[PDB]
Design a protein around this ligand. Structure first.
Ligand code: ADP
Ligand code: ADP
Ligand code: ADP
Ligand code: ADP
Ligand code: BEF
Ligand code: BEF
Ligand code: BEF
Ligand code: BEF
Lengths: 78, 52, 544, 514, 67, 513, 140
């Protein structure tokens, strides 16, 4: 009923929740690129919607070639 | 009496030959007395009601 | 927006929209039956959405068949059926007054008047309005002659209007002649009335009144006499249900050692007949039960040539026994020990003949010990009419009762409703200021009726009402009589005419109970400004 | 079997009452906006209409009513803005209120419309006289007579707080054209600039416009310049008809090239031989077209809006000349006192200041894109009340006054003329109070006490006495700066009633299908 | 209107009898015009609205779940 | 019934007020956390481009929000309005509104259309006093620069780039200096590249065109005398057009030589013009740079329209029309031209000492490819404030001084009118009083006790003062250098109580889908 | 106000403590408001409506308070302090200047209902109602 708007299909992750969604994803891109540093590190095989295979340890590679929807994440990916 | 065209236009008249002009009838019999008033308004201006 | 509570299905309208929706909802139920009233008025037909029809001019019954959607409308329907209780007639009209009171009241708050001021503007105009009735109705206490006038005015604006004069007396006479009771030192005519039937087919005018009741029943066995007349007849209204007899429940029957299952089988029937005879032995010219007689107990009432009626109307055997002096017996036992019956229980009539009325036959009971029995058996073309003819009856019988139960009567025909119109506004407007504009509308709202009595006639009648004004205003003002007032509308022929000079006359009571309740209804809605309407209980429709 | 299935018909009292009481709808909505305590409305048509104009027309246009007896009001209004600017709202009030007070007779009757119709038909033309009696041009005649007739109009609009400015604003532009003693009401130009405020609206005493560019090195401003209204494309626009250049020989191409170049090269020089400072054309020159003229110190112009350039010649006295090779020296416009490019909002306007020039272009600034427009339409209702204040120096003492005065007249005549014509006479009479009614209801001061005391006085005199809520109570609107042009009050009644009878001339209504 | 004028009559006559009377359409004395209500009436009302506000004001978060 | 055809909704009176008053504040609470360096930025994701914007700019913060409500979308206009006219403060231009009308809402318990009369007359008294307290001068370019920096600073603060506040405040005040008063801010283009770090964002006295010299040519230039040619270095042909048919077979024997020659006139026309470098609107055929490279003439094919002029108005060398028609008299006096070596593509350069000025305030910030945007729009918010002071010498102190002086002044008048319209006045003040209050929320100081504290000081001092966000002392803004231009803080005030008017007059509405 | 029951019954009444209950509510807190209205009825029996319009103003200004860095809890008891002062001031205003009569005087007991009887559907018919109530109570 309200509307209360704002608008439909839109959402306001505000304040601390914003603080969450903000922080709570930045380190998300951690567990993804953690492997790459250190000579003892290991690589990652990336697939896509076009049925292709990438197995390389570079980060720009594992961050550009990724699908992410949390601003901070994409931001660090940037 | 007001009449709203099949196109939505609004029309008001006293003339009976026009009332029917804007009216979509179905009755083959009524069609006749309508053809009358209409087949007069053209030949003679007034008198379209005394027809019907 | 909102948030407020609570949707969906639960909503509320505010101030203006409601005060309007309320007025519209009232003019709705009102404007439908606004044609009915007045001799010039007609009847209507309502369809049972299954083909079935029902022709009626009654406003009450007509509004019931409408269905009354909404609180404001149904509120009028409720006010309608109130009128029958007060009176019996005018239901068609009371609704109008009310509706007009709101219509105008709101048209005042729409002028930023505020309801409180208005709700009082009526509160007062009403009291003073009755104070004017004190001048009109009083002179109508003295004027059987003027009783047939009231019963006749209850015919017009009705189907039986064409045969008014004829049925005018059939109405009066049954109540006046044969319908009087007395409870706790009070004399009154049946507010539950006197049995009236309908005869399919036959002549209009030839509706047979009866010098007795008309119990609608058929002879139990064909072997019984179809009539027993002469004089001093033995009537018996027995609600004993003397048909058969089965063991008293909870009293099981286990036999042994016999060989005696038969020794009491008949004994079960014996005790029945033993009571049947005990009653037949006191008179038994005619037996009238409510429960019913049995085939194995009719043969006994048959051989004795005693007319027996299986399972009659309980509401009848009472009214019948009350006139024949009999006593509607309940249980056989009278004190202990008693069988029992006493010739002092039987009734006193003259004829008990089972008449015929077109593919149908009902038993009549002519003459009684106490001469108080009347039954009007109508007769017309179709059920469609013969029923409505009864509506005009139930609605006319009443007008008389109310009259004969209150010495004061009133010059109807738009007369009273006209005097008030002029009298309050010209003479009520002492307070002035704003309250005046209220009183004013309360008087103006009264013209609503006289108006429609005229508008009912296709012809321009805007003037016929204008005259009724100047005339009535003449009683006092403006700018030893002879009083030139007290006239009224002659809908039949255009132009004013003294109503008292005419058969027309309505019971004062009717002009009050209707003027009063029409106000309360109006008020109750005036106070309204917000209608919260919460949705009902929906079907589970659970996705799980 | 006729009639065709299906098309609705209302024969009887139905259309007779369900058209008046149906017209009353739209006439019940607008009946709140009028006068000092105004009630402006907002509405979102299909898509984001988001428009808030108090112009009764502007309102009744968005309702897009579909009902016949209602689209009559959306018509009886539309006309107003053709004859008289303001008053558009007040017409409907009566237009309906009449229909309204026609119900009582029509219902307790037993009275054919024809009777009611002519019954008002008289009262109408009767009132038209009383009005023509009151206007008086011009006791204390002054150029302020128009100015205060506008403060009666702008009053109670979305500009009233800042109105004394938008007052002198309107008058000025109006008095720039030769309509005194005839001239259009178009020449004043109303421009829309994004950001800003009502108070920050500029009254350019010349022209205004923006245009596409290709090189900014041009001079941004020039004092007392020479302006050529060219109207041509110079880049290299292809010939109208199928223009082609078939060739022969090796060394001819270049000849054609240098020829083409030459053709335009010349035209450009031609402009120079006019000694202008700013070339303003209605078509497109881009590229070298600008380049050269800019080197000479002239701000080239992209084709200037049609109705734009048509203002510039008159202000500058120049005459638009679609031909370049016959450009005379008496066709240019120098009237421009100072032409600059002072940037405003997110845009950049080229204003030609300065005057002896007809189109007093107004560059109206706003704070909201839905308000800049509510001010525009809030001056169209003014500039016109000014125009009519000039055309006829006859002024009606408005403010619910001319109404309360007409009423007493009609009410006076009706009594002598008693009969079935007395009521309908006392109709337009009573219904004439429609204005002073909610005119006060909107404010708040008690209306009933006010008119019961206004009539009680206006009746014994006070012929031009209206309801002035400035101090509460009521007084002669003739003393205060309350002046409504004649045409408004007069023409409106004749119009509001024209429909107040048409909708009674109605028997039934027959519809159609899609 | 009446509020302002009540403030005065309040400070002047210790709001002892002054108030708003709908009938009088102004500001006469409640007692003078026999307008009376029990001492509990308006005292047991405040005690509630306050102890109530407390409750509501103590609320910081609303979650839902089957009780 | 009709009407025009439902489904159409209709809201009138009481609720239509709340839903609008409460409807606006809805926007205001979120909007406010953007005042003073203790200010926040909000993220804004766009459906389509699926890229997000992070910055804090009231105009953009709301211009990037899909909002259904008319009363809200309305505010979103106010912001997008001041941003245009003024440039800064847009973040707050609504704050005083939502509060203002929330005030009006409570006051509405009392006719509305009259409340507008107060807020337009009483906040006019405020508007007046604020002019009185204003401090003009000086007009010596010696003093100006020191004020403009203080302005750019106070504005550039609270924006991601505040870190090196000076670094930017300098960027701004410079580009503003060039082009006297008052000139359009459309010639100085803010170009941005994704380059490692922050503060590597210098101001450029030339242009930074995208294009890189054609072929294997020199990357630098001495005593640059560039050339502004228009026509492409290709064999010409009339625009009307024509066809050339080789009727003669021997005609081609000469036609072929006509080719190489009809463009060799480009080289001859170049050396003769004394020009050293070149660049053309339209493109040049591979048959040209070849000749250019051997000669050492530099090739710069294709340049944007507005860039063709930037390179021009930089050296004032006139935009040449067609090759060989160009006078050596017209040439570009460029100090230098180089190819900066960014990752991937590298832009060319047109440095100028004056210069000229067609500033290009290029900003890098590799740190975050979406911070440049976040930043280069704050540099702007600076620029447009450093300009308003030139056009309007008037300036006033912030930190809550602005509102303090008004609410203080307005305050007295309200107690004098002793009119219902007068209470209106008092709110107009309490709305302003709200701005500093809110400014405290963010810094951390208690509001209630901070305004009362602040209002006493205006009396002791009057009207210099304000509330310190960070530095101690609760010191006067003139001391701490916390000031912004005066006309800006006017438009803000008026422009708000404007929408406060229109929006407070609506009463009823009608909405379709 | 008219109240259409979820069942169907119609209610028209001035008892705001019944009116509030009748009008379905969602917000759990709004619900709270209902009981505090139904309380004044079980306690005193009047002012079922007035107490609600109070619970508003208070909560509505505690709004204004929180909005200015005033702690909720500080307002809770902070208000409750003004509560006990109000319920006490009510005596210092009826000790005193006005009245506190309980018996032997109908001139007031009736006038208590006359005001009480007044301002309801029975406004017009109260005379009989007012006295009747008083008499029907004072005798128990
Ligand atoms: N006094 C009158 N003057 C003119 N026409 C009248 C007068 N009285 C009645 N009428 C009617 O008006 C005309 C007919 O109405 P009309 O709608 O024009 O029918 P039609 O156009 O088919 O002839 C006359 O011929 C007549 O019947
Ligand atoms: N002959 C009459 N002429 C004018 N008015 C009459 C006449 N008879 C009755 N009335 C008035 O108008 C009547 C309207 O009919 P009504 O009684 O309401 O419905 P019904 O008669 O069908 O029950 C009243 O009963 C009465 O007061
Ligand atoms: N250093 C400061 N100390 C106190 N108040 C300040 C200071 N700097 C700015 N302010 C105030 O708070 C600011 C809020 O920022 P604003 O220009 O409105 O939008 P944004 O910060 O997003 O560009 C005001 O413009 C100003 O008066
Ligand atoms: N033999 C080694 N012993 C210890 N540290 C090493 C050794 N060789 C390399 N490192 C260091 O370990 C780190 C991690 O590698 P890193 O730079 O993160 O690779 P990348 O950045 O491409 O993911 C140093 O940067 C560096 O390479
Ligand atoms: F006008 Be008529 F009827 F032809
Ligand atoms: F009025 Be009657 F009874 F229909
Ligand atoms: F107002 Be800031 F520059 F966003
Ligand atoms: F609530 Be009141 F006493 F009817």
């Amino acid at each position: 009923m309200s509307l209360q708007l704002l608008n439909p299909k839109a959402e306001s992750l505000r304040r601390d929740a914003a603080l969450k969604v903000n922080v709570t994803s930045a380190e998300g891109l951690q567990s993804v690129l953690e492997t790459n540093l250190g000579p003892k590190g290991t690589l990652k095989m990336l697939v896509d919607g076009a049925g292709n295979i990438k197995l390389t340890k570079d980060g720009k590679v594992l961050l550009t070639e990724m699908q992410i929807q949390s601003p901070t994440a994409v931001l660090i990916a940037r | 009496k007001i009449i709203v065209n099949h196109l939505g236009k609004i029309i008001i008249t006293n003339d009976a030959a026009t009332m029917l002009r804007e009216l979509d009838i179905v009755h083959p019999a009524v069609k006749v007395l309508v053809m009358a008033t209409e087949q007069q308004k053209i030949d003679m201006g007034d008198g379209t009601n005394l027809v019907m | 927006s909102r948030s407020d509570t609570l949707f969906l299905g639960g909503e509320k309208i505010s101030g203006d929209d409601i005060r309007n929706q309320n007025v519209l909802a009232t003019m709705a139920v009102a404007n439908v039956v606004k044609s009915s009233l007045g001799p010039v008025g007609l009847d209507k037909m309502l369809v049972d959405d299954i083909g079935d029809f029902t022709v009626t001019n009654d406003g009450a019954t007509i509004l019931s068949l409408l269905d009354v959607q909404h609180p404001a409308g149904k509120i009028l329907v409720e006010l309608a059926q109130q009128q029958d209780r007060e009176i019996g007639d005018g239901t068609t009209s009371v609704v109008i007054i009310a509706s007009e009171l709101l219509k105008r009241a709101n048209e005042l708050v729409k002028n930023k008047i505020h309801p409180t001021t208005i709700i009082t503007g009526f509160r007062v105009a009403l009291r003073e309005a009755i104070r004017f009735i004190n001048e009109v109705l009083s002179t109508s206490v003295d004027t059987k002659e003027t009783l047939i006038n009231i019963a006749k005015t209850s015919m017009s604006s009705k189907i039986i209007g064409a045969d008014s004069d004829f049925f005018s007396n059939m109405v009066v006479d049954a109540l006046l002649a044969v319908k009087t009771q007395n409870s706790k030192g009070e004399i009154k005519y049946p507010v539950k009335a006197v049995n009236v039937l309908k005869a399919h087919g036959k002549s209009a005018t030839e509706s047979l009144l009866v010098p007795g009741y008309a119990l609608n029943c058929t002879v139990a066995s064909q072997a019984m006499p179809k009539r027993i007349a002469g004089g001093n007849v033995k009537i018996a209204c027995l609600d004993l249900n003397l048909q058969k007899a089965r063991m008293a429940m909870g009293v099981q029957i286990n036999i042994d050692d016999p060989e005696q299952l038969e020794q009491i089988r008949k004994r079960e029937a014996g005790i029945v007949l033993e009571r049947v005879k005990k009653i037949i032995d006191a008179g038994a010219q005619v037996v009238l039960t409510t429960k019913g007689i049995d085939d194995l107990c009719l043969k006994e009432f048959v051989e004795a040539k005693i007319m027996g009626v299986r399972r009659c109307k309980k509401e009848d055997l009472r009214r019948i026994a009350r006139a024949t002096g009999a006593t509607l017996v309940s249980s056989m036992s009278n004190l202990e020990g008693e069988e029992t019956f006493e010739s002092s229980y039987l009734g006193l009539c003259d004829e008990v003949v089972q008449a015929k009325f077109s593919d149908d036959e009902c038993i009549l009971i002519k003459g009684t010990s106490k001469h108080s029995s009347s039954s009007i058996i109508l007769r017309g073309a179709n059920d469609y009419s013969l029923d409505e003819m009864e509506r005009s009856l139930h609605d006319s019988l009443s007008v008389v009762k109310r009259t004969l139960e209150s010495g004061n009567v009133v010059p109807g025909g738009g007369c009273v409703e006209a005097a008030l119109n002029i009298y309050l506004d010209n003479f009520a407007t002492t307070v002035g200021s704003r309250e005046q504009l209220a009183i004013a509308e309360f008087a103006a709202a009264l013209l609503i009726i006289p108006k429609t009595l005229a508008v009912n006639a296709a012809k321009d009648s805007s003037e016929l009402v204008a005259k009724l004004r100047s005339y009535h205003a003449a009683s006092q003002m403006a700018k030893k009589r002879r009083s030139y007032r007290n006239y009224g509308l002659d809908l039949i022929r255009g132009k004013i005419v003294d109503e008292i000079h005419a058969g027309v006359l309505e019971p004062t009571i009717s002009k009050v109970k209707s003027l009063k309740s029409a106000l309360e209804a109006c008020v109750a809605i005036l106070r309204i400004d917000t209608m919260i309407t919460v949705d009902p209980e929906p079907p589970k429709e659970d996705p799980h | 079997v006729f009639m065709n299935a299906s098309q609705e018909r209302t024969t009887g009292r139905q259309a007779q009452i369900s058209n008046i009481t149906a017209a009353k709808a739209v006439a019940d909505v607008i009946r709140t906006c009028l006068g000092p305590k105004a009630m402006l409305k907002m509405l979102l048509d299909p898509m984001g209409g988001l428009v808030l104009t108090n112009d009764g027309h502007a309102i009744l246009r968005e309702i897009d009513v579909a009902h016949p007896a209602a689209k009559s009001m959306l018509e009886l209004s539309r006309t107003q803005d053709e004859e008289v600017g303001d008053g558009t709202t007040t017409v409907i009030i009566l237009a309906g209120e009449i229909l309204a007070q026609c119900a009582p007779y029509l219902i307790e009757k037993n009275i054919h419309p024809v009777i009611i119709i002519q019954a008002l038909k008289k009262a109408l033309t009767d009132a038209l006289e009383v009005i023509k009696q009151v206007s008086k041009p011009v006791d204390v005649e002054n150029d302020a007579a128009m100015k205060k007739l506008i403060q009666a109009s702008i009053g109670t609009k979305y500009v009233i707080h800042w109105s004394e400015k938008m007052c002198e604003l309107a008058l000025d532009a109006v008095k720039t054209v030769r309509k005194d003693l005839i001239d259009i009401k178009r020449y004043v130009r109303v421009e829309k600039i994004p950001g800003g405020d009502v108070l920050d609206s500029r009254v350019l005493k010349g022209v205004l416009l923006n245009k596409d560019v290709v090189h900014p090195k041009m001079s941004r401003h020039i004092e007392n310049p020479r302006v050529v209204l060219l109207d041509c494309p110079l880049e290299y626009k292809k010939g109208e008809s199928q223009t082609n250049i078939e060739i022969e020989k090796e060394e001819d191409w270049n000849r054609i090239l240098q020829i083409e170049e030459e053709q335009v090269q010349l035209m450009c020089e031609q402009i120079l031989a006019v000694r202008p400072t700013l070339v303003i054309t209605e078509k497109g020159v881009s590229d070298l077209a600008q380049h050269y003229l800019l080197k000479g110190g002239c701000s080239v112009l992209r084709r200037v809006k049609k109705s734009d350039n048509n203002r510039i010649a008159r202000v500058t006295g120049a005459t638009i000349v679609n031909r370049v090779e016959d450009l005379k020296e008496s066709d240019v416009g120098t009237n421009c006192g100072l032409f600059k490019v002072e940037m405003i909002g997110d845009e950049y306007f080229s204003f030609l200041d300065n005057g002896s020039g007809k189109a007093c272009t107004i560059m109206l600034r706003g704070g909201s894109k839905d308000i800049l427009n509510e001010i525009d339409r809030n001056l169209q209702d003014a500039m016109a009340v000014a125009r009519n204040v000039m055309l006829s120096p006859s002024l009606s003492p408005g403010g619910g006054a001319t109404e309360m005065a007409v009423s007493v007249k009609l009410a006076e005549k009706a009594k002598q003329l008693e009969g079935i014509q007395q009521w309908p006479y006392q109709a337009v009479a009573d219904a004439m109070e429609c204005i002073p009614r909610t005119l006060i209801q909107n404010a708040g001061g008690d209306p009933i006490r006010l008119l019961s005391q206004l009539r009680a006085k206006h009746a014994q005199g006070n012929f031009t006495t209206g309801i002035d809520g400035d101090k509460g109570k009521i007084v002669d609107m003739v003393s205060y700066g309350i002046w409504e042009p004649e045409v408004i009050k007069q023409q409106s009644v004749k119009t509001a009633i024209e429909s107040a009878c048409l909708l009674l001339r109605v028997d039934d209504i027959v519809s159609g299908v899609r | 209107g009446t509020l302002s004028t009540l403030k005065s009559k309040q400070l002047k006559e210790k709001i002892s009898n002054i108030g708003v009377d709908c009938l009088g359409y102004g500001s006469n004395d409640m007692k003078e015009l026999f307008v009376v209500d029990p001492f509990i009436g308006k005292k047991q009302q405040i005690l509630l609205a306050t102890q109530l506000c407390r409750m509501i004001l103590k609320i910081d978060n609303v979650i839902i779940s089957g009780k | 019934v009709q009407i025009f055809g439902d489904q159409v909704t209709e809201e009138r009176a009481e609720n239509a007020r709340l839903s609008a008053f409460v409807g606006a504040i809805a926007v205001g609470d979120l909007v406010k956390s953007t005042l003073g360096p203790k200010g926040m930025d909000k993220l804004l994701q766009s459906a389509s481009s699926n890229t997000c914007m992070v910055t804090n700019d009231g105009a953009t913060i709301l211009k990037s929000i899909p909002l259904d409500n008319p009363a809200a979308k309305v505010l979103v206009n106010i912001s997008k309005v001041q941003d245009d006219e003024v440039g800064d403060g847009t973040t707050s231009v609504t704050v005083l509104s939502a509060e203002l009308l929330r005030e009006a809402e409570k006051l509405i318990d009392i006719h509305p259309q009259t409340i507008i009369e107060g807020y337009r007359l009483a906040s006019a008294a405020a508007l007046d006093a604020l002019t009185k307290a204003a401090v003009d001068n000086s007009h010596d370019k010696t003093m100006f620069r020191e004020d403009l920096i203080h302005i750019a600073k106070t504005t550039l603060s609270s924006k991601i780039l505040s870190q090196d506040k000076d670094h930017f405040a300098e960027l701004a005040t410079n580009a503003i200096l060039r082009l006297k008063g008052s000139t359009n801010l459309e010639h100085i283009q803010i170009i941005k590249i994704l380059g490692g770090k922050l503060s590597d964002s210098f101001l450029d006295e030339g242009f930074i065109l995208a294009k890189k010299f054609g072929n294997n040519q020199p990357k630098r230039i001495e005593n640059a005398k560039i050339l502004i040619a228009n026509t492409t270095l290709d064999t010409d042909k009339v625009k009307i057009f024509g066809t050339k048919f080789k009727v003669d077979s021997t005609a081609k024997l000469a036609q072929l030589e006509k080719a190489e020659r009809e463009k060799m006139k480009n080289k001859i026309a170049k050396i003769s013009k004394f020009g050293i470098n070149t660049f053309i609107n339209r493109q040049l055929i591979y048959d040209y740079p070849e000749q250019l490279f051997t000669d050492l003439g530099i090739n710069s094919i294709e340049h944007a329209d507005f860039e063709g002029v930037e390179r021009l108005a930089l050296v004032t060398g006139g935009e040449v029309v067609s090759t060989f028609d160009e006078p050596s008299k017209c040439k570009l006096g460029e100090c230098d031209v180089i190819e900066e070596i960014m990752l991937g593509e590298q832009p060319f350069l047109k440095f100028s000492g004056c210069k000229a000025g067609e500033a290009c305030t290029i900003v890098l910030r590799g740190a975050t490819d979406q911070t440049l945007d976040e930043a280069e729009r704050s540099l702007h918010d600076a620029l447009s404030v450093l300009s308003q002071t030139t056009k309007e010498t008037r300036t006033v102190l912030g930190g809550g001084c602005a509102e303090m002086v008004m609410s203080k002044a307005v305050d007295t008048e309200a107690q004098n009118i002793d009119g219902k319209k007068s209470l209106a006045v008092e709110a107009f003040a309490r709305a302003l009083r709200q701005l500093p209050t809110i400014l405290a929320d963010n810094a951390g100081f208690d509001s209630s006790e901070l305004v009362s504290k602040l209002r006493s000081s205006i009396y002791n001092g009057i009207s210099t003062s304000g509330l310190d966000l960070n530095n101690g002392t609760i010191a006067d803004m003139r001391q701490l250098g916390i000031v912004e231009s005066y006309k800006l803080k006017r438009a803000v005030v008026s422009s708000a109580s404007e929408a406060a008017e229109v929006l407070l007059r609506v009463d009823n509405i009608i909405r379709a889908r | 106000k008219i109240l259409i029951s979820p069942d169907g019954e119609i209610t028209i009444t001035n008892d705001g403590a019944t009116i509030l209950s009748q009008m379905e509510l969602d917000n759990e807190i709004a619900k709270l408001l209902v009981q505090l209205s139904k309380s004044q009825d079980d306690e005193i029996g009047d002012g079922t409506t007035g107490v609600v319009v109070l619970a508003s103003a208070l909560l509505d200004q505690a709004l204004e308070l929180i909005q200015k860095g005033i702690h909720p809890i500080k307002i809770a008891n902070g208000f409750d302090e003004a509560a006990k002062l109000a319920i006490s001031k009510l005596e210092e205003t009826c000790d005193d200047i006005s009245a506190s009569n309980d018996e032997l005087f109908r001139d007031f007991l009736l006038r208590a209902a006359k005001t009480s009887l007044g301002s309801k559907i029975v406004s017009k018919d109260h005379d009989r109602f007012a006295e009747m109530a008083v008499e029907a109570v004072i005798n128990v």
